[PDB]
Amino acid sequence: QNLKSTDRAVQQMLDKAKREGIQTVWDRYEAMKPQCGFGETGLCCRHCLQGPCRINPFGDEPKVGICGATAEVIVARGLDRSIAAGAAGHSGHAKHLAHTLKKAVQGKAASYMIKDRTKLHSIAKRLGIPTEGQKDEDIALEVAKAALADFHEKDTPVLWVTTVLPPSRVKVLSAHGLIPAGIDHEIAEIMHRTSMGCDADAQNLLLGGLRCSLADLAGCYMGTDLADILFGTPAPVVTESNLGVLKADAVNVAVHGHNPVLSDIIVSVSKEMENEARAAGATGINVVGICCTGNEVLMRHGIPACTHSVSQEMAMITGALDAMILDYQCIQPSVATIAECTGTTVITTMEMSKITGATHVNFAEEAAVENAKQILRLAIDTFKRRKGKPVEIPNIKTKVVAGFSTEAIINALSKLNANDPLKPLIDNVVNGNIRGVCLFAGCNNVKVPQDQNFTTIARKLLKQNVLVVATGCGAGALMRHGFMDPANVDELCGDGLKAVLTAIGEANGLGGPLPPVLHMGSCVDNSRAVALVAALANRLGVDLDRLPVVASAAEHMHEKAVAIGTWAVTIGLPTHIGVLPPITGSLPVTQILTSSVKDITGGYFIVELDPETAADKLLAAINERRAGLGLPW
Amino acid sequence: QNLKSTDRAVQQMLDKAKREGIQTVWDRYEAMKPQCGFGETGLCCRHCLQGPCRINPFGDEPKVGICGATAEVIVARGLDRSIAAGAAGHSGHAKHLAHTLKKAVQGKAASYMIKDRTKLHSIAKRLGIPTEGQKDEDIALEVAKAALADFHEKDTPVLWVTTVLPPSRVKVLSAHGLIPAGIDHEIAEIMHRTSMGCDADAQNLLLGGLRCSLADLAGCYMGTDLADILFGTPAPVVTESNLGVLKADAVNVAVHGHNPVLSDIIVSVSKEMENEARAAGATGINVVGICCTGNEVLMRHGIPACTHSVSQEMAMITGALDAMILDYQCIQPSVATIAECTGTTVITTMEMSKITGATHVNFAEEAAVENAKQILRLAIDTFKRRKGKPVEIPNIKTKVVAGFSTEAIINALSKLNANDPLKPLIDNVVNGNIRGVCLFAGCNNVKVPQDQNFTTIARKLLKQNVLVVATGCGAGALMRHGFMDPANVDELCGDGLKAVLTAIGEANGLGGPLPPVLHMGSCVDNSRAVALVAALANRLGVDLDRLPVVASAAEHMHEKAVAIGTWAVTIGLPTHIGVLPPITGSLPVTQILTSSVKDITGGYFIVELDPETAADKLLAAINERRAGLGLPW
Numbered sequence A, B: 001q002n003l004k005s006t007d008r009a010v011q012q013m014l015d016k017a018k019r020e021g022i023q024t025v026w027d028r029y030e031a032m033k034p035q036c037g038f039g040e041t042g043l044c045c046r047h048c049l050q051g052p053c054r055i056n057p058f059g060d061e062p063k064v065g066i067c068g069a070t071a072e073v074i075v076a077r078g079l080d081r082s083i084a085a086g087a088a089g090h091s092g093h094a095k096h097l098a099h100t101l102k103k104a105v106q107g108k109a110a111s112y113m114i115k116d117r118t119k120l121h122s123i124a125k126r127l128g129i130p131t132e133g134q135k136d137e138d139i140a141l142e143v144a145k146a147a148l149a150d151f152h153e154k155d156t157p158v159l160w161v162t163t164v165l166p167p168s169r170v171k172v173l174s175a176h177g178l179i180p181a182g183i184d185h186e187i188a189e190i191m192h193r194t195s196m197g198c199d200a201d202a203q204n205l206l207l208g209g210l211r212c213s214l215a216d217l218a219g220c221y222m223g224t225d226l227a228d229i230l231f232g233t234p235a236p237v238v239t240e241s242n243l244g245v246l247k248a249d250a251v252n253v254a255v256h257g258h259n260p261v262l263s264d265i266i267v268s269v270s271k272e273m274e275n276e277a278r279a280a281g282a283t284g285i286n287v288v289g290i291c292c293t294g295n296e297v298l299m300r301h302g303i304p305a306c307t308h309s310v311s312q313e314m315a316m317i318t319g320a321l322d323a324m325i326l327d328y329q330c331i332q333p334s335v336a337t338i339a340e341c342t343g344t345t346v347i348t349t350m351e352m353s354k355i356t357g358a359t360h361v362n363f364a365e366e367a368a369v370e371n372a373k374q375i376l377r378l379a380i381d382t383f384k385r386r387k388g389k390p391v392e393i394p395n396i397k398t399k400v401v402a403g404f405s406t407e408a409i410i411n412a413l414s415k416l417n418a419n420d421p422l423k424p425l426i427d428n429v430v431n432g433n434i435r436g437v438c439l440f441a442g443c444n445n446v447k448v449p450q451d452q453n454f455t456t457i458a459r460k461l462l463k464q465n466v467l468v469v470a471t472g473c474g475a476g477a478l479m480r481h482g483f484m485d486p487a488n489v490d491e492l493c494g495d496g497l498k499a500v501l502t503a504i505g506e507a508n509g510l511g512g513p514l515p516p517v518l519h520m521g522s523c524v525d526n527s528r529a530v531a532l533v534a535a536l537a538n539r540l541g542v543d544l545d546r547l548p549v550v551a552s553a554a555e556h557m558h559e560k561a562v563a564i565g566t567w568a569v570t571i572g573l574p575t576h577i578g579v580l581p582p583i584t585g586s587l588p589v590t591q592i593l594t595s596s597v598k599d600i601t602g603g604y605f606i607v608e609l610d611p612e613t614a615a616d617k618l619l620a621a622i623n624e625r626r627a628g629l630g631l632p633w
């Protein structure tokens, strides 16, 4: 089972699923082999009903699509649609939060409110919305209206791009025509330009893709901004992760998906219903997190993380998961089928994300508390049904220190330098105590033994004094393997990095260091890493493509992650990807994405499937940046 | 060559291409065989990097996608993305026209103007925009702003749906939650809901698809509305079609693509440059049309149609095509490669639609006349280069009477009944002289011998007194085979239909009948057929799903055509499709689309690859409607 996952709790549940005959994502992967090589290489097109068209990577016919689409056109068009689909997910998330904020401050959903007034005001100032002599409710109404206006063409470009990146970066992007005009506008233009008989130039296609990836960045940043206003900016918290956070004697309720608009309500309502759960025979309601909704409530509330991504079915296999509350994105639909064997009540809540065989509860922000009670009562019924069953919860968990929003990181640094909080970090970059910064982002992928790339690359970077931050299921992988426990700083971190984590931690009263890896939140919270890197760029007076900062989507799967990797490249970062996207069928497209895009944005993709080699390549990229700043390395 | 195309001029050029070694769309199709069955059946998914996933239609594993996506989920998700991509094309077209109208009435593009003031005012009244005591330029500014507002969420739903369909139809759709909230909003929501780990219920997925198809209908209707304002509502015109409209001794310039914003300028500027062309040794500039841009200028100006769709390369093979002026959609990118052998200058003009190896001319509405002159001068240079070459223009063409906008049809009918123009048509439906109405729409497809389905079905319907209207390449197919020549009414039409076409034609002073088939314009002008059918519904006081009206996308290929067929079903029409979309891999999805959608919208797909059988099925559908109205059949 260790070829399937490096997580020992997941291995234990894979053994249980096997002897009980429950098919898993790994079984379904095995049943798919060998996978189609045309699709793997990107040389397949189904964009019209003359298709499907394919192109042999090498040899004889077919060499070209029926309409004349070349290999480079077909590869670029498919990649562009992946970017647009990812942008559509992150921006649908953000749009939903914008409507929730609008409802809240218009008196239509009393369960929701302005919880972070400081964040609201700083966002308004960044957008140029006036605060002086304005009610908060009117400032917030203005912010929500500005968020919704960024989805369509207007007199300004997308402000959640142009106001969040350094001005020099905005100028470089504008010179290449890469600034998005509207989030949904760009998504639609990609789908238009990639349809049959439209754009057929690989460079032109990919430039459109870079612009659409910035529409995705805008959605990520909008989502983080609005969620912080509504639910609070994260601050450092201590919790636990992995399957051992389930409790056989409680009602175990997983919040799963990405948008925390209801799951944040579940967290607060679940506390209210403790006595109702105790009457059922439970100690209470044990809310646990899966995937990014789990990351959201871990970040703000210290809700323990149960599992992530590829291993999500395993939480059900314990037999102790009484409910799984779903919104959308990265939910394996298999969970609706597995629930028939495990007893779990799977509940969908979003109109546009239903799963056949799961129970649907129409959630409305206007009725959020009532909805949460109905949902939790289904969970309590399920707990009662399994009175007197044995469960197998692996006795495996890690300690997780998290909550490192960019505001929290700046506050932590401010204890070393009150009026110049970024300077102690730059100081230690300059003197070599911090070699650089690497963001781990993205998913797990059944093709990669779970967490193997994240942990293997992270161990090598930390030994070389790289400051490592993480989001999404990259944060999930690192947290489940102890990388967010400060007790492991001695084992994991080089001396220079240990010195810095220790100095910051001790100045924040901890008597101990910051954790080896800083958890900066969910997938949309990749925008937080942008905010930190942009602040560093502005303080140093250079663009992002001169900073010793890299990203690694070490095990990515989702179209969302393809979008994130593309905007990481677009804003100027060397961006490692540890699974092949469908690009190997076109050498010209691969060369643009790995080499010549350097001349446009300064970032570039680093394709490397071997994690040890990837770490060497990421260090090389960091050190080349150091050399370009005239620093030793 | 008759297995490839039923058009004799195309056959002649296929022989020329063969002996000169020029590869055609039919050659590239042959080189694709056998095509992938997973893609043909819809049982393939590449929506994440754990893919590609496939499902065996029958037999053993794989039976399910790696994430657990079932066959019905995978089929529905792929179909939904096809609909969204089509909506993105039609609405990008309409958006471009909305910005052009806005520029024109704000003094920024003097080449453009309000040419149809009556249409502008009637649109404003339909939208509830006040006209009394308003300048035209302000009414138009308001109309363009309303058009742009329909692309995003606002206080109203998409008005180019709710104000163009009968109120009873809007109520039925609203009850099922099918009214679009914003055009690009729906496109993005489809791409979100279909991404990995999101919507996984086939019925839910397809309901989203129906709503997105209405976003496409809105784009079509907006495009027709704005083009009529800017360039004039079509009225009956006489011209010619097929390759013989090229002239060896003129500068032959093809306008090709869909959006006529520049091609309408080409038409007027080309006249201005006659003397400049004569100095080159040409008789003048011979502008000809390909695909829907060709249909636009045929409809408004009587520009002869050269060819359509699948056979577009053949116009180049003549050796006489001096320039091909492209905007976007349905342009085979092969044309850029063929031009190296045929001498044609291929010119792209739209930023998001470039083709490698073609010359690009940045077109701006602000500089449209200057751009047109640069483009036509490249064409005149090309004509000079082929002085003293032999060309092979097939001496084959048909007479085409066209220009049947809905306003023109109502005006023609008004000569029989001034205050009640629709009543003479309904009268003849009731008494059986007109059995019903069939709209032919959509593309040609290399899988179907060119025009064979359109002509075979049309001949049978016309003999059975069906009133036949056509758009796009369905109009192209019928016009190239003589179906728009009134001289063929005796041969083609049943006695009842002949009587009606004759009575209308004679009352409009013609001394002869209307043509056997009424050409209602381009693909977006399918909205004109909706306007006519909606007017008939309102005059009869019934919904569209009670009218004896059907549609046939007899040879369709483009994602745009999939969207059109889906909204034809959604507004209540029996809708024949003559090529299989990728749905046969899911019986539940096929049953929804061919049977149970009747219970939601009253329309339904009729899948029939055999054209003789399709005509029998379309007649059966028409006659069932007649019976439901208590009419003889």
Ligand code: SF4
Binding pocket: A045, A046, A047, A048, A049, A050, A051, A052, A053, A065, A066, A067, A068, A069, A074, A195, A196, A197
């Ligand atoms: S768009 Fe071109 S390459 Fe794609 S399926 Fe259609 S004919 Fe084939």
Ligand code: SF4
Binding pocket: B045, B046, B047, B048, B049, B050, B051, B052, B053, B065, B066, B067, B068, B069, B074, B195, B196, B197
């Ligand atoms: S979304 Fe599911 S079915 Fe599609 S490629 Fe990914 S794992 Fe396979």
Ligand code: FES
Binding pocket: A036, A037, A038, A039, A040, A044, A045, A052, A054, B036, B039, B044, B046, B052
């Ligand atoms: S041929 Fe397998 S992905 Fe299309």
Ligand code: FES
Binding pocket: A036, A039, A044, A046, A052, B036, B037, B038, B039, B040, B044, B045, B052, B054
């Ligand atoms: S397996 Fe051929 S279309 Fe994917």
